[PDB]
Symmetry: C2
Subunit: 298 residues, 2 copies
């Protein structure tokens, strides 16, 4: 079956007051004015649920679903039973309460999808439904999700998963996945944005790399944990794309295809100097575009 990619649980803390370095190393501040801290965008978080009422999240969350047999499965109850969904949702979109933590898109909303049970597992139908479900949800304003993220890997290349992948990518949904540690799909899907990881010193088939070592975020019981692993990189990109859609679309005065946004993600990627099989397009440096604008060698 399909699982949560494995990771070290470096620390559980009760109360933090910082911008997790992951966030600011990727240069999310620099770009928050232009992207409205991501306001307007809805990241669909496909994981283990969430602490709906967690103090950093609750106001960034607009609904969700539960495709897992857990608790019921009562469709209307996706409140986390693991702490991943939480940690992840927090990296993508923790708000500026003047407290705790704040993620890459402290303004993008979240739609919580729980296709993963408390042990971490999921059946593949649950995850293919997770993605399809991402695509089709429209809120009260008919508002829509354009970004989807998972930190899961399956060995079983099924058609059904792929039909959904292409279905999501076919309608302007960016689908973001952490690149496995066996743990291959959906990440080995060429249409998916596959994220691998580096630490803060920028040491380590993928598209980009983002931070994954010693990253703090939300955890269960209004808690906080610090996680090291390959699954922690992806959520930084999901967040990032939220700020990329706002800032791109504003610039081109026009809506953009996800192929055009994939473009836009990868140009906010600086290479580190490992070859491209090792680092894809590079490290996510959000502000790259401004730094290089006026620049030519004579």
């Amino acid at each position: 079956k399909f699982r949560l990619i494995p990771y070290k649980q470096v620390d559980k803390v009760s109360a933090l007051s910082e911008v997790p370095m992951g966030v600011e190393i990727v240069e999310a501040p620099a770009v928050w004015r232009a992207s409205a801290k991501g306001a307007g965008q809805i990241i669909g978080v496909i994981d283990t649920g969430c602490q709906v009422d967690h103090p950093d999240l609750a106001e960034r969350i607009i609904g969700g679903v539960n495709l897992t047999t857990d608790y019921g499965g009562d469709e209307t109850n996706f409140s986390d039973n693991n702490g991943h969904g939480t940690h992840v949702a927090g990296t993508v979109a923790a708000a500026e309460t003047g407290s705790g933590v704040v993620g890459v898109a402290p303004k993008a909303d979240l739609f919580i999808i729980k296709a993963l049970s408390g042990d971490g597992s999921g059946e593949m139908g649950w995850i293919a439904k997770a993605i399809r479900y991402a695509v089709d949800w429209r809120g009260p304003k008919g508002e829509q999700m354009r970004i989807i993220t998972m930190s899961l890997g399956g060995p079983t290349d099924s058609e059904e998963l792929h039909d959904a992948v292409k279905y999501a990518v076919s309608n302007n949904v960016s689908v973001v996945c952490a690149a496995g540690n066996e743990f291959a799909y959906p990440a080995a899907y060429n249409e998916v944005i596959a994220v691998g990881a580096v630490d803060f010193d920028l040491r380590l088939e993928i598209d980009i790399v983002a931070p994954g070592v010693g990253i703090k975020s939300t955890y269960l019981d209004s808690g906080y944990a610090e996680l090291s692993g390959t699954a922690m990189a992806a959520p930084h990109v999901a967040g990032a794309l939220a700020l990329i859609i706002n800032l791109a679309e504003d610039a081109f005065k026009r809506s953009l295809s996800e192929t055009e946004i994939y473009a836009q993600l990868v140009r906010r990627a600086t290479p580190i100097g490992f070859t491209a099989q090792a680092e894809g397009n590079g490290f996510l440096t959000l502000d790259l575009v401004e730094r290089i604008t006026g620049q030519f060698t004579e």
Copy 2:
């Protein structure tokens, strides 16, 4: 009709011997080693023909087709009765013969598609076919085009032409296209790569990228050269660059790359100049930008 995006003739010559500033201002040569100068990539030129026996091009051409009524039309006579097509061919892949002129990818091969007549006009039909021929054409060794370049337009939104554009892209073929100076289609199709123009001063006079379009010299009728200015002269620099991009990037990635990822591989080698997103899309083609940004983190 669909037609050549109008443009200026400046000079005709018989003798030139230079690397055109377009070629190196775009930084082809600084990425030739890594790219093998496009070796093994084929660009299909959908235009007015080409002069297959031209000294700078002969060795770059592999085949072509004529889908026009000119010359019979004997499908096997994709020669050029305008001059524009020979010019385009030139900027894409003119060869290094140590004289005359040299293109952006001097080791890419060129498959020539006449879909335009002497006066630069062709029929809405001829281009939709041109695009499917370029997609479906395989070689003696089953080799193919990953690149299509046209620098024509037409006022009509037909599903036939939009289907062909869709068909290329979904089969990993990059549609490169001069955007407009009435000439709205293909360039206005979201899935195409629209190329505006800037001059050598990186000035200008719905786009993805921009390249040089002012006073660009290239091959031209009768084994000669000519200097042309206009939006349509930008495009071939992009078409020839993607040859180099596919090569270097697939080789640094160790993996085949789809057109989508090839498109991104192109945008990320565009330097904004300071103009608006609408005036310059992602910016001017600077092929070497990645190596230049490679180590560069802030603090």
